[PDB]
Design an enzyme around this catalytic site. Structure first.
Site, PDB file in Angstrom:
ATOM      1  N   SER A  80     -15.780  16.826 -41.051  1.00 55.03           N
ATOM      2  CA  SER A  80     -17.126  16.430 -41.457  1.00 55.03           C
ATOM      3  C   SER A  80     -17.153  15.564 -42.710  1.00 55.03           C
ATOM      4  O   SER A  80     -18.064  14.767 -42.884  1.00 55.03           O
ATOM      5  CB  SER A  80     -18.004  17.654 -41.692  1.00 55.03           C
ATOM      6  OG  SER A  80     -18.046  18.462 -40.538  1.00 55.03           O
ATOM      7  N   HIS A 129     -22.705  25.110 -49.622  1.00 59.77           N
ATOM      8  CA  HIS A 129     -21.821  23.969 -49.786  1.00 59.77           C
ATOM      9  C   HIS A 129     -22.557  22.709 -50.175  1.00 59.77           C
ATOM     10  O   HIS A 129     -23.776  22.596 -50.011  1.00 59.77           O
ATOM     11  CB  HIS A 129     -20.928  23.757 -48.554  1.00 59.77           C
ATOM     12  CG  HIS A 129     -21.580  23.026 -47.421  1.00 59.77           C
ATOM     13  ND1 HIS A 129     -20.886  22.129 -46.638  1.00 59.77           N
ATOM     14  CD2 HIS A 129     -22.836  23.075 -46.917  1.00 59.77           C
ATOM     15  CE1 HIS A 129     -21.688  21.653 -45.702  1.00 59.77           C
ATOM     16  NE2 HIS A 129     -22.877  22.210 -45.850  1.00 59.77           N
ATOM     17  N   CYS A 170     -25.619  17.066 -45.923  1.00 63.35           N
ATOM     18  CA  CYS A 170     -25.818  18.093 -44.909  1.00 63.35           C
ATOM     19  C   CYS A 170     -27.283  18.493 -44.956  1.00 63.35           C
ATOM     20  O   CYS A 170     -27.888  18.511 -46.032  1.00 63.35           O
ATOM     21  CB  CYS A 170     -24.934  19.312 -45.195  1.00 63.35           C
ATOM     22  SG  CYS A 170     -25.065  20.663 -43.989  1.00 63.35           S
ATOM     23  N   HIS A 222     -16.028  18.885 -48.950  1.00 62.33           N
ATOM     24  CA  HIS A 222     -16.953  19.955 -49.317  1.00 62.33           C
ATOM     25  C   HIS A 222     -16.604  20.558 -50.671  1.00 62.33           C
ATOM     26  O   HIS A 222     -15.429  20.679 -51.018  1.00 62.33           O
ATOM     27  CB  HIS A 222     -16.902  21.108 -48.303  1.00 62.33           C
ATOM     28  CG  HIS A 222     -17.083  20.690 -46.875  1.00 62.33           C
ATOM     29  ND1 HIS A 222     -18.259  20.898 -46.188  1.00 62.33           N
ATOM     30  CD2 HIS A 222     -16.232  20.104 -46.000  1.00 62.33           C
ATOM     31  CE1 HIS A 222     -18.122  20.457 -44.947  1.00 62.33           C
ATOM     32  NE2 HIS A 222     -16.905  19.963 -44.811  1.00 62.33           N
ATOM     33  N   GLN A 244     -15.162  25.219 -38.605  1.00 59.93           N
ATOM     34  CA  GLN A 244     -13.961  24.439 -38.888  1.00 59.93           C
ATOM     35  C   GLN A 244     -13.035  25.208 -39.831  1.00 59.93           C
ATOM     36  O   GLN A 244     -13.471  25.769 -40.842  1.00 59.93           O
ATOM     37  CB  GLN A 244     -14.331  23.075 -39.471  1.00 59.93           C
ATOM     38  CG  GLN A 244     -15.186  22.222 -38.530  1.00 59.93           C
ATOM     39  CD  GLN A 244     -15.452  20.828 -39.060  1.00 59.93           C
ATOM     40  OE1 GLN A 244     -16.584  20.483 -39.401  1.00 59.93           O
ATOM     41  NE2 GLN A 244     -14.403  20.017 -39.135  1.00 59.93           N
TER      42      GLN A 244
HETATM   43  C1  3T5 Z   1     -17.622  22.596 -42.056  1.00 62.94           C
HETATM   44  C2  3T5 Z   1     -19.128  22.841 -42.237  1.00 62.94           C
HETATM   45  C3  3T5 Z   1     -19.437  24.345 -42.403  1.00 62.94           C
HETATM   46  C4  3T5 Z   1     -20.219  24.674 -41.132  1.00 62.94           C
HETATM   47  C5  3T5 Z   1     -21.041  25.967 -41.123  1.00 62.94           C
HETATM   48  C6  3T5 Z   1     -20.152  27.186 -41.448  1.00 62.94           C
HETATM   49  C7  3T5 Z   1     -20.889  28.529 -41.293  1.00 62.94           C
HETATM   50  C8  3T5 Z   1     -21.605  28.568 -39.946  1.00 62.94           C
HETATM   51  C9  3T5 Z   1     -21.382  29.607 -39.043  1.00 62.94           C
HETATM   52  C10 3T5 Z   1     -22.034  29.599 -37.814  1.00 62.94           C
HETATM   53  O1  3T5 Z   1     -21.868  30.514 -37.006  1.00 62.94           O
HETATM   54  C11 3T5 Z   1     -22.895  28.557 -37.491  1.00 62.94           C
HETATM   55  C12 3T5 Z   1     -23.126  27.499 -38.366  1.00 62.94           C
HETATM   56  C13 3T5 Z   1     -22.550  27.402 -39.634  1.00 62.94           C
HETATM   57  C14 3T5 Z   1     -23.691  27.473 -40.657  1.00 62.94           C
HETATM   58  C15 3T5 Z   1     -21.720  26.104 -39.741  1.00 62.94           C
HETATM   59  F1  3T5 Z   1     -20.716  26.213 -38.872  1.00 62.94           F
HETATM   60  C16 3T5 Z   1     -22.539  24.832 -39.374  1.00 62.94           C
HETATM   61  O2  3T5 Z   1     -23.770  24.762 -40.117  1.00 62.94           O
HETATM   62  C17 3T5 Z   1     -21.748  23.503 -39.534  1.00 62.94           C
HETATM   63  C18 3T5 Z   1     -21.061  23.427 -40.913  1.00 62.94           C
HETATM   64  C19 3T5 Z   1     -22.097  23.231 -42.030  1.00 62.94           C
HETATM   65  C20 3T5 Z   1     -19.946  22.368 -41.009  1.00 62.94           C
HETATM   66  O3  3T5 Z   1     -19.134  22.376 -39.822  1.00 62.94           O
HETATM   67  C21 3T5 Z   1     -20.493  20.941 -41.199  1.00 62.94           C
HETATM   68  O4  3T5 Z   1     -20.648  20.457 -42.322  1.00 62.94           O
HETATM   69  C22 3T5 Z   1     -20.812  20.111 -39.947  1.00 62.94           C
HETATM   70  O5  3T5 Z   1     -21.374  18.824 -40.260  1.00 62.94           O
HETATM   71  P1  3T5 Z   1     -21.348  17.609 -39.146  1.00 62.94           P
HETATM   72  O6  3T5 Z   1     -21.573  18.351 -37.735  1.00 62.94           O
HETATM   73  O7  3T5 Z   1     -22.350  16.557 -39.428  1.00 62.94           O
HETATM   74  O8  3T5 Z   1     -19.858  17.011 -39.127  1.00 62.94           O
END
Ligand code: 3T5
Length: 144
Positions: A135, A40, A94, A138, A112
């Site tokens: 967040s 992303h 990110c 995206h 999310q």
């Molecule tokens: C919405 C994005 C996407 C999330 C990721 C999705 C895949 C995943 C599965 C998991 O099992 C564990 C971690 C990830 C890799 C993920 F959940 C996380 O890295 C968080 C991600 C990027 C995120 O929530 C974020 O942009 C938080 O940014 P802020 O906290 O600053 O607001």
């Protein structure tokens, strides 16, 4: 068609196109896995849950300004002028920017919901439109 697709008419040209309300993808041509791998590019804004990133300690841009930036990146990626990876590395708010936006593989339940729903509705190699979460905004690329 596949999950989330509707037929629409181009506002400017009148030609038929297809829009996916889950991924916000749109395309001219007529169009679930247990795990997916995605990258992303995140653009944060002043109403982001964490309005800070490696790029900028205090993120002050408006949501509207963030969407304009996202739309521009999508244009450049679709035109081939820029690669998704290049823009993610340079401009994603990110920490995954350091990995060309790669988040690795995951199943449902981990994240999310708008991001999850978009990720699992994309085809392999397909890119989303702007996807909104707490967040920020995206662009999601499904790589596996
Ligand atoms: C919405 C994005 C996407 C999330 C990721 C999705 C895949 C995943 C599965 C998991 O099992 C564990 C971690 C990830 C890799 C993920 F959940 C996380 O890295 C968080 C991600 C990027 C995120 O929530 C974020 O942009 C938080 O940014 P802020 O906290 O600053 O607001």
């Amino acid at each position: 068609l596949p999950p989330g697709w509707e037929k629409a008419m181009s506002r400017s040209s009148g030609r038929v196109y297809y829009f996916n309300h889950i991924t916000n993808a749109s395309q001219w041509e007529r169009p679930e896995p247990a795990r997916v791998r995605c990258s992303h590019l995140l653009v944060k804004h002043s109403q982001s849950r964490r309005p800070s990133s490696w790029r900028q300690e205090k993120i002050t841009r408006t949501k509207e300004e963030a969407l304009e930036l996202i739309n521009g990146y999508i244009q450049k990626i679709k035109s081939g002028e820029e690669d998704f990876e290049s823009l993610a590395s340079q401009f994603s708010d990110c920490s995954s920017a350091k990995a060309r936006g790669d988040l690795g593989a995951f199943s449902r339940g981990q994240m999310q919901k708008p991001f999850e729903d978009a990720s699992f509705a994309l085809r392999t190699g397909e890119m989303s439109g702007p996807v909104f979460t707490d967040s920020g905004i995206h662009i999601i690329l499904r790589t596996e």
